[model samples]
Target: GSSGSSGNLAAKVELVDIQREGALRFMVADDAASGPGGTAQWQKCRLLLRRAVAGERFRLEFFVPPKASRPKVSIPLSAIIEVRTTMPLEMPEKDNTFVLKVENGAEYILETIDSLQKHSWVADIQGCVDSGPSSG
Candidate 1:
């Protein structure tokens, strides 16, 4: 999450959607600020997942609208956020493990286990605002 500092302005990043494919699920967050100056003020952003499955690999993806003008950057999911899972399913139990790989500028891969069952998943994505060098 982007923290508001004296010189560091906290930018807002909101979770827009979450989709599941096969055994994997993707948590998506987009730059949702309106107005022309919204994208210009963006610095960095992150997505956090709650109630995540442990021992499983998860991927992160970011989407910037056409109006956004910021350059794309690579960020490690471990660096910006943390994940964990609880309540293991009975029987096969499956691996419930997954691997994360960036598919493109707007997509990511999260390998998941087919046997694992989840009641719900939560995510928290954040971004930093480029307050500018003049910020004081």
Candidate 2:
């Protein structure tokens, strides 16, 4: 009775139609300081992004482990209060961090491949947020 080969064939499946695009990846960093005491703390999570609706939302399905069901996260687009780019020259790694403020949430810090991409994504996101949401 010991190989731990337990099987449950009654697992329920959830269906999701790929809400948007395919594989728009992003690394999510939270806390940024869970490493240890006094060390430069940075928390990074790799997310399989589905789509980004400029000035609308960023939706993605999480790739969880076995026996763990996958869940997607949807972040609504709104007026982001601030956008800050980290000093890549100062850091050892070349992540080129960009921290943006989202409504009712922690600062979403994103790592971009380059300045141009970051610039454009930020502009488009803000374009929608800055335009304001629906009314009436």
Candidate 3:
């Protein structure tokens, strides 16, 4: 019997070693050629803050953007250049956006629903990067 049902299945968010988990939107700044061609597209993602022995990193997972197993983007705390708030030109009225620049990882423009969370994320991430091991 090779019959199959023709209905949608229920969905659930993936769980793992997450310190902080929430919904956010992100855009890869490197994907664009510094112009308006690919600037306005922001994809919704599930952000999970993961802790590690080496350092802390935020892992952003996606459901509607890429393959379940492939869209897990991890940016290490040690590699982050800075976490600063910025107002995107397309969305000048909203201050809930921030820029995450990584020396090794790609730059990401991330947005939360409110400014409080934005500030909190920036503070927490910067704190982790600063308080991590000084061996390097």
Candidate 4:
């Protein structure tokens, strides 16, 4: 089978003065076929979420360690539709796991270091979601 190149892009991205950044376990939760079949895979990565300081746009970014073959992700806060905590039976961490759904129907499941960290991220994202993109 050919490698998946559909979503790969050659453009370069730059992020500046990230406000809140930390290591977290991240995974895309689009695997609806996870019943007695394939399961969702988690990627260990650091989440870089920026605050809307100086009227900058709210955005979130994450990249795996060593920055290998997989492409990094940058999500503008405007696209996020929901942010909530969840406890999946399959997930090893229960207290700090949360789900963030975007407008394009992508559900991202992430686990932070602790409940405090999880709530902090959730609140920040949700706040920006309600405040509009250029509010800050």
Q: Which stretches of candidate 3 lie over 4 Å from their true place?
A: 1-18, 31-39, 54-71, 88-93
Q: What are the Cα lDDT values of the candidates?
A: 0.31, 0.46, 0.64, 0.71
Better of 1 and 2 by lDDT: 2
> What lDDT, from 0 to 1, does candidate 2 have?
0.46
The order of the candidates by TM-score, greatest first, is 4, 3, 2, 1
Question: For residues 1-136, what per-residue lDDT tens digits would candidate 2 score against the true structure?
Answer: 4653433324264744233222223434465454675634433333343324432344423333212345433455443565665643545544445666655555655555566555555555555455543531
The list of candidate 1 runs beyond 4 A from truth reads 1-40, 43-56, 63-71, 82-136
Cα lDDT tens digits, model 1, 40-115, are 2323332233222232223333323312353133343333332333323532332443222233333332324343
Which stretches in model 4 have alpha-carbon errors above 4 Å?
Answer: 1-17, 32-40, 51-56, 66-71, 88-93, 133-136
True lDDT of residue 45, candidate 2: 34
What TM-score does each of the candidates earn?
A: 0.19, 0.44, 0.65, 0.66
Model 4 / residue 119 / CA error / Å: 0.9
Question: How does residue 53 of candidate 3 score in lDDT?
Answer: 47
Angstrom error at residue 48, model 2:
9.6
